Design a protein around this ligand. Structure first.
Ligand SMILES: CCCCCCCCO[C@@H]1O[C@H](CO)[C@@H](O)[C@H](O)[C@H]1O
Ligand SMILES: CCCCCCCCO[C@@H]1O[C@H](CO)[C@@H](O)[C@H](O)[C@H]1O
Ligand SMILES: *[C@@H]1O[C@H](CO)[C@@H](O)[C@H](O)[C@H]1NC(C)=O
Ligand SMILES: *[C@@H]1O[C@H](CO)[C@@H](O)[C@H](O)[C@H]1NC(C)=O
Ligand SMILES: [Ca+2]
Length: 549
């Protein structure tokens, strides 16, 4: 409360809840992170506001549901894939960084943003971290992907199939058959038609070739504030370079309260390690990466000790969302991570994607070794940190996040989340319910995905319909009793079935009455590659090579 301690927010990319040591895993080496759970609280029911990178991060930064800022899509694209697109965290939203920055904190973002860059001009940076509360930024505007490192890139495959291969095949077959018929004297085919097919194939093929050659350079680069330092992004000691920038930040603020947000690229698809982690792993390169990530955390702790700030510094650890279930290469390699006993993962509202690692450590205040089980949200630190810094919560808008200091200081035993909603981009998927006078977790599902190999089909389940199956009355679970979420409830729990789904179903109805009309930050105009938005470090246009790193 107006304490003004140092705040370190550490967010791992896609790290499953069932991967760290302090959570069940027995083979992975996540020491420094366990050396953070034993020193404080371990959230056992930490819920990310979304299964995708962009919206989850959007919710974290704002403490508001992705829909309030219109940072969730209705299409199959739930995250930004082009640095040169105009969609981003709304210029009118307020991040906890801006909040802390106004109270005089030194703010820094090290690593991944994934909330847009510019709007109308390549340099307006309307959505850049420096126009959302951060004084300093070292990292990447978009996100790490297979395509950022030559060896895979099956991120676009589904589209490559529908947009290039298949039509390339229709044209091809059409031309081969037209040639046979014409050659057989069953049809006269004018040169003008063969020309039209060749032309169309050349065009589709050139665009596809263009895409393959430029995607990586135009979308995978390193930045330092408003400038490109490395294009394309190199993996030479990436996790190490983030740490140094993080470490260097803390150090230049040993006497000023500071806010550090370390958003690692790990362990998002396209794993990697330094010379020091390559090989020794559990379930492959992923483990090699996760364990490298942990070495980074530890590196920051020892610095906190070295500088004697560890005692008056709030540290938090989490993952933007669950580990990727359907993430396996072609030559075999099984990536993605694990979410333990839980069902689902990255891209669906099944615990495995909603649930997630949540750790808090503040020596001077939080009782080390503690363990909370009440339902907590990804959006909860926005209000928690605002208080810590004495920054006032915004009153012109609603905040879904709930301060969690009373829960971590034992001043309270129940979290203010008896009604949590689970969206799937713009689509209101599930709905949780921790009844006031009970310890049961009622979870309804207005719909559910449709796991591909009975969702390796499209690489990621959706929220649309052609891959979604609605329910009426709403399907219902009781994660409190059945966490594994491997058995719907209707027989025994039938004495209050229609009863509960009446109190829950109303929530959504009364809830959706606070969802204002806001622009779709994920519309086609805000998601598509805009040439005039492309940052190109060397020359002008598209031939951007950079490495000031
Ligand atoms: C006050 C901030 C205004 C930001 C928007 C500025 C729009 C005009 O700015 C111009 O936009 C062109 C198209 O993107 C660019 O090619 C020019 O280099 C840029 O100067
Ligand atoms: C974007 C991909 C579109 C694929 C559609 C291909 C339709 C076939 O192509 C069309 O075939 C006609 C007769 O064979 C020709 O007269 C047309 O000029 C030709 O464009
Ligand atoms: C530990 O992690 C590996 C992959 O990193 C995974 O295969 C294993 O299942 C995890 N252990 C648990 C808790 O299931
Ligand atoms: C560490 O990063 C530096 C960057 O200059 C590089 O020279 C070195 O080889 C890296 N360590 C590795 C991967 O051996
Ligand atoms: Ca992610």
């Amino acid at each position: 409360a107006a304490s003004r301690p140092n705040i370190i927010l550490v967010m791992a990319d896609d790290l499953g809840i069932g991967d760290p040591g302090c959570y069940g895993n027995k083979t992975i080496r996540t020491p420094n992170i366990d050396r953070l759970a034993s020193g404080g609280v371990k959230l056992t029911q930490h819920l990310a506001a979304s299964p995708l990178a962009t919206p989850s991060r959007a919710a974290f930064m704002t403490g508001r549901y992705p829909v309030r800022s219109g940072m969730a899509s209705w299409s199959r694209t739930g995250v930004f894939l082009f640095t040169a697109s105009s969609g981003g965290l709304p210029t009118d939203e307020i991040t906890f960084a801006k909040l802390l920055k106004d109270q005089g904190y030194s703010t820094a973002l090290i690593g991944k943003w994934h909330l847009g860059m510019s709007c109308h001009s390549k340099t307006d940076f309307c959505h850049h971290p420096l126009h959302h509360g951060f004084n300093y930024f070292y990292g990447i505007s978009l996100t790490n992907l297979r395509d950022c490192k030559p060896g895979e890139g099956s991120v676009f495959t589904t589209g490559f199939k529908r947009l290039v291969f298949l039509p390339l095949q229709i044209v091809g077959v059409t031309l081969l058959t037209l040639a046979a018929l014409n050659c057989l004297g069953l049809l006269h085919v004018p040169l003008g038609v063969f020309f039209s097919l060749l032309f169309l194939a050349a065009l589709i093929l050139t665009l596809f070739l263009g895409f393959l050659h430029y995607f990586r350079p135009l979308n995978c680069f390193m930045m330092r504030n408003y400038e490109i330092i490395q294009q394309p992004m190199s993996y030479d000691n990436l996790t190490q370079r983030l740490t140094v920038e993080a470490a260097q930040f803390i150090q230049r603020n040993t006497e000023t309260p500071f806010l550090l947000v370390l958003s690692y690229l790990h362990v998002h698809t396209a794993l990697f390690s330094s010379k020091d982690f390559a090989g020794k792993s559990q379930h492959g390169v992923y483990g090699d990466a996760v364990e490298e990530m942990d070495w980074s955390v530890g590196q920051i702790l020892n610095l906190l000790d070295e500088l004697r700030l560890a005692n008056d510094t709030l540290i938090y650890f989490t993952s933007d969302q669950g580990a990727h279930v359907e993430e396996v290469s072609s030559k075999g390699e099984i990536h993605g991570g694990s979410n333990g006993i839980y069902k689902g993962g990255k891209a669906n509202n099944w615990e495995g994607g909603i649930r997630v690692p949540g750790i808090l450590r503040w020596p001077r205040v939080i009782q080390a070794g503690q363990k909370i089980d009440e339902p907590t949200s990804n959006m909860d630190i926005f209000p928690t940190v605002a208080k810590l810094a004495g920054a006032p919560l915004p009153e012109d808008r609603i905040i879904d996040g709930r301060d969690l200091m009373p829960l971590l200081e034992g001043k309270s035993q129940r979290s203010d989340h008896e009604f949590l909603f689970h969206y799937c981009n713009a689509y209101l998927n599930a709905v949780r319910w921790h009844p006031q006078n009970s310890t049961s977790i009622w979870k309804a599902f207005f719909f559910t995905p449709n796991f591909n190999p009975v969702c390796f089909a499209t690489h990621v389940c959706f929220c649309f319909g052609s891959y979604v199956t609605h329910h009426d009355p709403p399907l219902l679970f009781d994660i409190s009793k059945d966490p594994r979420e491997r058995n719907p409830l209707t027989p025994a729990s039938e004495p209050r079935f229609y009863e509960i789904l009446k109190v829950m179903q109303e929530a959504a109805d009364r809830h959706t009455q606070t969802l204002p009309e806001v622009p779709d930050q994920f519309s086609w105009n805000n998601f598509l590659w805009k040439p005039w938005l492309q940052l190109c470090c060397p020359s002008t246009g598209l031939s951007c090579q950079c490495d000031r790193e």
